[PDB]
Design a protein around this nucleic acid. Structure first.
Ligand SMILES: Nc1ncnc2c1ncn2[C@@H]1O[C@H](COP(=O)(O)OP(=O)(O)OP(O)(O)=S)[C@@H](O)[C@H]1O
Ligand SMILES: Nc1ncnc2c1ncn2[C@@H]1O[C@H](COP(=O)(O)OP(=O)(O)OP(O)(O)=S)[C@@H](O)[C@H]1O
Ligand SMILES: Nc1ncnc2c1ncn2[C@@H]1O[C@H](COP(=O)(O)OP(=O)(O)OP(O)(O)=S)[C@@H](O)[C@H]1O
Ligand SMILES: Nc1ncnc2c1ncn2[C@@H]1O[C@H](COP(=O)(O)OP(=O)(O)O)[C@@H](O)[C@H]1O
Ligand SMILES: [Mg+2]
Ligand SMILES: [Mg+2]
Ligand SMILES: [Mg+2]
Lengths: 261, 325, 319, 329, 348, 261
DNA sequence: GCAGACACTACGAGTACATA
DNA sequence: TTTTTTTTATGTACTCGTAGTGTCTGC
């Protein structure tokens, strides 16, 4: 028996819109610690992890380690019918083949139950190494979304550089290069605007733009964002979503050109 | 000063006196300019004959450098020339007068066969209504892709292929301007392989001079890869004089030794069979078979099998020609 | 001032200066003198005088009220579905004081370019306001105009101008411009005109500007002989399976710089109206289309056109 | 320490490593010195080195730091419409030539637009390139690469200097293959390398692929002719003799049996056409029989190039050669 | 699970036939610098099994854990097309002909995004990813011309195993870029050995006569042989040597169509045969297989001096069918030409 | 080395929004006197002559004279994400292609370096006659924009006349005519709203309303505009920017033919 | 000073067709 | 005396619906 209750309905209504055009399905792993989602995209470029602990739910019942697989083309239409500040309960039986979402109508007069068929998918955990990254930085969330949106009008792919000075975004296209930098934003009143550096070894890697925009579609879930990079490890984009848990994004770099001699 | 330019762009006939061939047409257009009676022109012909150079020389003769941007509107296939462009910038350029100095304006539509027929139908009353204010010049390679209403409104000049007799002095000017050592057989090979096209003549001249340093018949036919006349005569003699296996071995050795292609061999053999006094039933069969072989070479087909079929097309007709007697 | 070319300088301003189609032009003269003209659609070849006849009729009918009682629309205008609804109908509703027998005239020049929906919207504004406004449409292809519009108008069809009709106008222009000439040069101008007065005036202007005298050599130095009369001899040679003369005509057309697409278009246009057996004509047309597919693919050489000629000669001797 | 296949590992980095294409290599070597580079049109059979020559020339002209600023490479793997030619190619060609080589080597004052596999572009998109090539020729160069030059329109053919890449001769191909095998510590017999350059038929990419795969199959020992015949897809001579005996017998059932036996053995129909053509032109048949049979072979090869079914084309060719071999009996 | 999927071998050492080719394929993919592969042969020869064996040789046992991923691609006409994809954590499997003539839009946009991106985990996954393009002979030439620079540029980090039936439909630029691996059909003895092994693993006893008849009726298709053997046990467990083997319905319908062609030669019979050919084309039978079955049944009714002309006409109208777009025109043209020829032969 | 410094970003935004649908590409002619830009439109009917003085910039250095041809849609996309109160630095090297626009975010924290690639247009210099005009009118720019917008509703081509009395506008359209005549409006408390007549000979000329409406978009640059008209020289719309420079718009008259009658 | 309402153009989207 | 439906692959053109958005009115 899986029976969970949310404290805010805006968490799903901000976390499923980033996964609407990014991943084709949502696979939830049920455990006593919490719910874990690890989904790789169809092009094998992006990897989405979402760990919501059991301490953040209003209530949480889990007896067996179960895995549920739901689609996105129906859950995205179901989520738009739901409200914003209401409560969402997720229900799943031991032997049934459906997942029930029970919430309140936006008219706030009746309870709405929606059932989704459980897709039996055969996946395996890829396994993140959780190694020491050569660069860790902290950035504002909405500022990072505006940065990723401003490079969309220039080039189809972006270049992320990270020395000890800060984080440099570059966009080289047929129009011309767009280079922006953020450095030393500790002298502000808001704690979420602190652009800080945490590691030493500089890294320069070219990533895609569409997947970064899909990553920045989940910006008002958290206050700050974290970016981790290394010489060959994919880019890690970390959101600390309130108290119930956190989300990780893995984006593979592009193949570098033959600039040798 | 010197510039890094191709010889088809470094040597462009900036004036009308530097073009070589179409002397009556150029004299008529020069008298159009001098009498101030320039009509809407339609320049059509094969590529590399000097239509764009003609209209650019006429535009440079008609207008000065201080006013050239306000009098000439030049549009080609690299620009958008839809019906919104005809109703937009072209109609506003036609319906308004000049800025700096008085004069009639010039709309050049290079590669006018690439225009849509909606745009060509919108062009008709723009050309007819503003004849006194602006002039139109259409340039095309295919006259059938221009509507007959636009062909009525313009006086058409056929810029035919350049004859090799008038083609020689311009090539000699380019040779003397570039310090190129060329023989008479090299110039003959240039005007033969160009086939009424100064672009490919200058391109083959520049390629041969860069590849070998001299321009002779051997260097031109080696840089181009074209077979010589003696090679084609040998191929025809082998196909008409001996059996399948010996002719196949000789033609295969000639193609492997000199690196010949079957398209040029087919072209020269097709030029040869109209010179050889064949019977009419033999000639029809040869033309049909060679057209089939040339059509088969346009896709991913093995060239050895097509060479064997080329030998086969004459080995069929050998007995027929001899038994005709 | 810049002097107009002879096409635009010698455009007729009265309906009696228009040569060719004598009965239709005479009835238009009667209608311009009297009034109460029905809705009119003039179809024909280019350069026949359809726009000239419509504009002369409108000018002679309206007189000094031409600026406020005429609406002229071209293919250079928008004239879509939103212009027939909003501009043409508002002009048809517009009050214009005119003498008796005179109506507002909505000239729709080059009516092939109008879409089907605009012509459908034109029908009821043609039928309702017919006591105050009239319509004068000019076109080349009459099948582009829909059948309700052709039923709502008198469909006048202009034929191609003959040699004497163009010769009279050429004599008028020559006597106006003091152009010296011979009879052979005027015959060459008629030959290059091919029933087109625009091409006749353009070729006469070009020859007189380039050489100052009109004989056959000065005309043929700048102008060109027509294509399908020479293509028809090649098709006649292909009918009798005479491949040598057909290739002579084909190679003469090839060395003149004509592309394979223009040559095969002329071959198809001759073979459409040629005088031979109908089954043989269909075999010829199918072989021409088979060759034209190869021309459009990219293989367009002299050998391909020679193979087309050889296949057309094969079609004769294959019952 | 990733492993890379030998086709990309032995790609020519400079124009001196390009084999057998002496005229275009001489032209590009002169243009390296400072001569006027014209617009280029490379055309020829697959695997002759059309892409490698222009990429090595661009690497020698611009170096590593100016390849991204001076070379615009567009092939059929990306979209090339008429609007891509009107917008992207024209805006690239209208740019100024900026940047200088930091290693002291000379830099040419133009850009290079490499329109590889230009067969697939439409005629309107090719017509939109014409005044772009003519007007902007002071600051950019164009290199069209194709396999069939008839698919490129006559104005673009006239504007470009045409170079035909010949198939590689047996001497040069054998020399290059032996040099590659010497650089890879691979021993290959004379019969093996002779059958390799016979099979590859002027395709050096196919030869390098076969040499690498025969190295990987044997594990590092000597490559013999048996490994080359195993990896080359060459039909055995007993099958060809059985096909000719079945067509000599005049029975259509034996013909269907040998055609089904060749189809069930997975043999390619083009390989059978090549081997049957070699047997026919190296036989003692009469000229008329050889003539019709080679004409049918050419028609069957054309039909197979248009994606017809192999079984029906081979049974039609076998019926034709059966009629030819049974008419004279 | 059927017998075609229950006893399929997993590794290259467990194959029952083409064992020398299996050892050569094991030696080829050991180093990791193996080129692009083009696995070709008749249908049911075992090409897909050997492709999955090569994949299991390259990667771990996680290759067999598969999933369905749907990708939406925008055409140049801006019509969105959804295409399915068999995927794993190490390889990808695309059949672009499911997008029809939009297959090039699969190659130009969906494939390059696979090729331009490196692997997320280079420890579990190798330095390269493998993309299996299934049925590349059904690709249009535009998709094959879009394939080649993606194959050349990203070969070091993205390998391709193309699979087809005939390499004649593959353009020479693609065939020049890949190593062609020929998988012939198993022989009658090999199919008998495979069927005997499957029956003994199932606990059943299979005679040599029934195994030989199944192998001969299967036309050297091991998939169809295993399906026919399973249908034979189902319908009758005691295996008689003369037990009736079931047959597919479209083959019998094609045989009766050819018998109807033979029986009468009249425009009304041509109308009825055209109705039968629409019935065959409606059931998604490919028109080349209709042509092959029509030839294989019409040659059983012709005489000795007509079969070559019938075969040449069948090849000619098959070529015209491939050059065209409406199959019923060329199929009915072949039937009408055969009717005219057969009437001429019977009356004279 | 070229380095100009716009003191505020609003003037460049107003200039590049005035020319956006009119000018194909921007040719910045650079000297020690300032920045000049003489560019025709795509239809070759209008002409734009913008002159920015060196004293109007914050810092202006120019060693050798330049002529930078750059695209305008790219510069419009660059200047769209630019503030109105921040300094904007224009940088260019001697033999490079990067024209650099360096500014700050509207958040006023991070830098933004947007490069553009220079074009090669080598267009010939168009000679401004700089002769005296038979009619010079000082009028407010907002009233000129309002009267052009009001005349765009009636017709498409507008006959503008000027005499000793004042400027007169006529639009003979399909609904009818609109004749607006304004004169001697100097008797207000404002100084910008005034109609002044300087020169003598009356002129009547017809112009397209689309180019006039494009010219009126420079209204926030200058409070008072000048109209210069004569029988031969074109119509000049002169905006005098307060402490940066001036902007001249040249519009050619349409060809009008009288009735034969 | 800031929320509601008005028309404005840019942009997405569907459909037809392309010859003599 | 007899009528239902979406494929062909781009390029262009037309027509209609929708959505930011600048500006005006009002308390
Ligand atoms: N008559 C000529 N006299 C001298 N040089 C010529 C002549 N015709 C062509 N050329 C040369 O060829 C170059 C290109 O000729 P163009 O004027 O472009 O011919 P074209 O008729 O416009 O060909 P198309 O149809 O546009 S491809 C010129 O720059 C000259 O170098
Ligand atoms: N019948 C004619 N009599 C005298 N001059 C004529 C005649 N037809 C044409 N012209 C001359 O040719 C010019 C063009 O005539 P138009 O009437 O514009 O041609 P059109 O009949 O409208 O053909 P299209 O289809 O519009 S190209 C006129 O200005 C005259 O100078
Ligand atoms: N002439 C050559 N000299 C040296 N190596 C060559 C040559 N031709 C081919 N190769 C090798 O084979 C590979 C293929 O060469 P390519 O340049 O791609 O052939 P290609 O002309 O592009 O064939 P197409 O037309 O693109 S299928 C190269 O990367 C080299 O490794
Ligand atoms: N070596 C083998 N041993 C046993 N069964 C096999 C073997 N190879 C193939 N098969 C069976 O034969 C069938 C062949 O199908 P497949 O592997 O898809 O080949 P193809 O792709 O040529 O159709 C498969 O269902 C498989 O189970
Ligand atoms: Mg030109
Ligand atoms: Mg007209
Ligand atoms: Mg290549």
């Amino acid at each position: 028996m899986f029976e969970a209750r949310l404290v805010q309905g805006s968490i799903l209504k901000k976390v499923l819109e980033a996964l609407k055009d990014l991943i084709n399905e949502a696979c939830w792993d049920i455990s006593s610690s919490g719910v874990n989602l690890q989904s790789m995209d169809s092009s094998h470029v992006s990897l989405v992890q979402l760990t919501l602990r059991s301490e953040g739910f209003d209530t949480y019942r889990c007896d067996r380690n179960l895995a549920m697989g739901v689609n996105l083309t129906s859950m995205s239409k179901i989520l738009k019918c739901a409200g914003n500040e209401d409560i969402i309960t997720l229900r799943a039986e031991d032997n049934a083949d459906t997942l029930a979402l029970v919430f309140e109508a936006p008219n706030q007069e009746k309870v709405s139950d929606y059932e989704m068929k459980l897709m039996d998918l055969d996946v395996e955990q890829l396994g993140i190494p959780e190694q020491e990254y050569s660069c860790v930085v902290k950035m504002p969330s909405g500022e990072f979304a505006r940065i990723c949106r401003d490079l969309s009008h220039i080039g189809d792919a972006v270049v992320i550089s990270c020395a000890k000075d800060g984080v440099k975004f570059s966009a080289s296209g047929e129009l011309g290069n767009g280079n922006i930098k953020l450095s030393q934003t500790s002298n502000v009143d808001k704690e979420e605007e602190a652009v800080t550096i945490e590691m030493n070894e500089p890294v320069q890697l070219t990533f895609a733009l569409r997947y970064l925009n899909f990553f920045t579609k989940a910006t008002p879930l958290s206050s700050t964002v974290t970016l981790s990079m290394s010489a060959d490890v994919p880019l890690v984009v970390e959101y600390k979503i309130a108290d119930m848990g956190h989300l990780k994004y893995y984006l593979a770099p592009k193949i570098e050109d033959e600039e040798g001699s | 000063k010197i510039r890094n330019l191709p010889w088809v762009e470094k040597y462009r006939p900036q004036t009308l006196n530097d073009l070589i061939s179409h002397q009556d047409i150029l004299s008529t257009i020069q008298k159009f300019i001098n009498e101030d009676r320039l009509p809407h022109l339609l320049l059509y012909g094969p590529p590399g004959t000097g239509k764009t150079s003609t209209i650019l020389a006429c535009a440079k003769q008609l207008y000065k450098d201080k006013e050239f941007g306000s009098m000439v509107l030049e549009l080609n296939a690299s620009d958008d020339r839809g019906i919104d462009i005809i109703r937009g910038p072209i109609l506003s350029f036609a319906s308004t007068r000049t800025i700096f100095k008085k004069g009639f304006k010039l709309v050049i539509l290079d590669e006018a066969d690439a225009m849509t027929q909606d745009a060509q139908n919108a062009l008709r009353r723009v050309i007819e209504k503003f004849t006194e204010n602006t002039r139109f010049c259409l340039i095309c390679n295919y006259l059938s892709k221009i509507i007959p209403a636009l062909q009525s409104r313009c006086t058409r000049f056929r810029f035919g292929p350049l004859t090799p007799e008038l083609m020689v002095p311009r090539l000699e000017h380019v040779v003397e301007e570039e310090k190129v050592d060329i023989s008479e057989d090299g110039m003959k090979a240039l005007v033969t392989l160009s086939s009424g096209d100064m672009r490919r003549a200058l391109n083959i001249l520049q390629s041969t001079n860069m590849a070998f340093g001299k321009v002779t018949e051997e260097t031109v036919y080696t840089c181009t890869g074209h077979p010589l006349k003696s090679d084609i005569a040998n191929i025809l003699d082998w196909m008409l004089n001996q059996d399948f296996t010996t002719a196949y071995r000789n033609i295969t050795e000639l193609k492997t030794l000199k690196g010949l292609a079957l398209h040029d061999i087919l072209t020269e053999i097709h030029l040869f069979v109209h010179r050889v006094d064949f019977p009419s039933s033999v000639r029809i069969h040869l033309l049909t078979k060679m057209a089939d072989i040339e059509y088969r070479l346009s896709v991913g087909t093995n060239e050895k099998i097509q060479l064997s079929s080329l030998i086969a097309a004459f080995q069929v007709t050998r007995d027929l020609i001899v038994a005709e007697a | 001032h810049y002097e107009l070319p002879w096409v635009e300088k010698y455009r007729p301003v009265k309906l009696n200066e228009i040569v060719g189609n004598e009965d239709t032009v005479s009835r238009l003269e009667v209608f311009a003198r009297e009034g109460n003209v029905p809705n009119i659609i003039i179809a024909g070849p280019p350069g026949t005088g359809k726009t000239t006849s419509i504009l002369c009729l409108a000018r002679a009918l309206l007189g000094p009220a031409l600026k406020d009682a005429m609406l002229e629309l071209n293919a250079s205008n928008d004239r879509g579905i939103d212009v027939v609804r909003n501009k043409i109908k508002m002009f048809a509703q517009q009050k214009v004081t005119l003498p008796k027998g005179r109506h507002k005239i909505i000239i729709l020049d080059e009516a092939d370019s109008m879409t089907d929906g605009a012509q459908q919207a034109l029908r009821r504004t043609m039928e309702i306001y017919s006591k105050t406004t009239r319509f004068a449409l000019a076109c080349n292809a009459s099948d582009k105009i829909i059948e309700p519009i052709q039923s709502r108008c008198a469909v006048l069809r202009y034929t191609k101008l003959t040699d004497a009709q163009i010769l009279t106008r050429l004599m008028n222009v020559i006597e106006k411009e003091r152009v010296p000439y011979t009879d052979d040069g005027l015959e060459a101008i008629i030959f290059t005109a091919q029933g087109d007065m625009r091409q006749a005036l353009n070729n006469l202007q070009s020859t007189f500007s380039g050489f100052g005298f009109i004989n056959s050599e000065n005309v043929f130095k700048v102008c060109d002989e027509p294509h399908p009369l020479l293509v028809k001899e090649m098709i006649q040679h292909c009918v009798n399976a005479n491949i040598d003369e057909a290739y002579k005509i084909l190679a003469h057309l090839w060395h003149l710089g004509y592309s394979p697409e223009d040559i095969i278009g002329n071959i198809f246009r001759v073979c459409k109206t040629f005088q031979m057996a109908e089954y043989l004509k269909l075999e010829f047309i199918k072989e021409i289309g088979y060759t034209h597919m190869k021309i459009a693919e990219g293989v367009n050489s002299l050998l391909q056109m020679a193979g087309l000629l050889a296949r057309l000669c094969q079609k004769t001797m294959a019952p | 320490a990733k492993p890379v296949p030998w086709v990309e590992k032995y790609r020519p980095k400079c124009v001196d490593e390009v084999a057998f294409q002496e005229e275009v290599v001489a032209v590009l070597k002169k243009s390296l010195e400072g001569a006027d580079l014209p617009n280029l049109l490379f055309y020829g059979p697959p695997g002759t080195g059309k892409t490698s020559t222009i990429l090595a020339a661009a690497r020698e002209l611009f170096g590593p730091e100016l390849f991204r600023l001076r070379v615009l490479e567009l092939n059929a793997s990306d979209e090339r419409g008429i609007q891509v030619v009107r917008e992207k190619v024209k805006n690239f060609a209208q740019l100024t030539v900026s940047g200088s080589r930091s290693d002291g080597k000379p830099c040419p004052p133009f850009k290079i637009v490499i329109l590889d596999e230009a067969d697939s572009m439409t005629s309107a998109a090719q017509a939109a390139l014409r005044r772009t090539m003519e007007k902007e020729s002071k600051t950019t160069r164009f290199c069209l690469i194709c396999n069939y030059v008839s698919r490129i329109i006559e104005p673009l053919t006239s504007r470009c200097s045409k170079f035909r890449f010949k198939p590689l001769s047996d001497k040069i191909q054998q020399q290059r293959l032996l040099d590659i095998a010497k650089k890879e510590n691979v021993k290959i017999s004379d019969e093996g390398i002779a059958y390799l350059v016979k099979v590859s038929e002027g395709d050096l990419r196919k030869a390098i692929t076969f040499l690498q795969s025969a190295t990987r199959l044997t594990g590092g020992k000597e490559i013999t002719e048996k490994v080359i015949t195993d990896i080359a897809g060459v039909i055995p001579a007993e099958k060809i003799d059985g096909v000719f005996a079945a067509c000599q017998s005049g029975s259509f059932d034996k013909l269907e049996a040998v055609v089904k036996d060749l189809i069930d053995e997975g043999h390619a129909a083009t390989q059978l056409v090549n081997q049957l053509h070699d047997v026919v032109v190296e036989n003692n048949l009469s000229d008329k029989q050889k003539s019709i049979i080679t004409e049918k072979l050419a028609e069957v090869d054309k039909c197979l190039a248009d994606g017809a079914d192999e079984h029906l084309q081979l049974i039609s060719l076998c019926a034709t050669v059966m009629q030819q071999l049974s008419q004279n009996c | 699970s059927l017998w075609v999927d229950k006893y399929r071998p997993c590794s290259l050492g467990r194959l029952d036939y083409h064992k020398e080719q299996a050892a050569q394929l094991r030696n080829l993919v050991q180093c990791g610098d193996f080129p692009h592969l083009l696995v070709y042969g008749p249908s049911g020869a075992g090409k897909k099994t050997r492709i999955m064996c090569i994949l299991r040789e390259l990667y771990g046992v996680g290759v067999e854990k598969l999933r369905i991923e749907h990708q939406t691609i925008t055409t140049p006409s801006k019509k969105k097309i959804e295409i399915s994809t068999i995927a794993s954590n190490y390889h990808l499997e695309v059949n672009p002909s499911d997008a029809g003539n939009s297959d090039r839009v699969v190659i130009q946009e969906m494939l390059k995004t696979v090729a331009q991106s490196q692997q997320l985990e280079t420890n579990s996954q190798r330095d390269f990813k493998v993309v299996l393009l299934t049925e590349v002979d059904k690709l249009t030439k535009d998709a094959q011309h879009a394939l080649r620079r993606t194959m050349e540029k990203y070969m070091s980090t993205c390998r391709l195993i193309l699979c087809c039936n005939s390499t004649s439909k593959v353009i020479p630029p693609i065939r020049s870029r890949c190593l062609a691996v020929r998988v012939p059909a198993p022989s009658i003895e090999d199919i008998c050995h495979v069927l005997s092994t499957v029956c003994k693993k199932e606990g059943l006893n299979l005679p040599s006569q029934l195994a030989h008849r199944l192998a001969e009726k299967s036309c050297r298709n091991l998939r169809k042989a295993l399906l026919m053997c399973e249908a034979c046990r189902v319908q009758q467990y005691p295996f008689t040597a003369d037990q009736e083997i079931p047959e597919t319905d479209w083959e019998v319908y094609l045989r009766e169509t050819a018998n109807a062609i033979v029986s009468q030669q009249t425009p009304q019979r041509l109308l009825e045969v055209r109705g039968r050919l629409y019935e065959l084309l409606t059931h998604c039978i490919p028109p080349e297989i209709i042509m092959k079955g029509l030839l294989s049944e019409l040659l059983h009714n012709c005489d000795g001096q007509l079969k070559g002309e019938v075969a040449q006409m069948a090849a000619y109208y098959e070529h015209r069918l491939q050059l065209g777009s409406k199959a019923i025109y060329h199929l009915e043209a072949f039937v009408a030409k055969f009717m005219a020829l057969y009437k001429k032969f019977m009356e004279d």
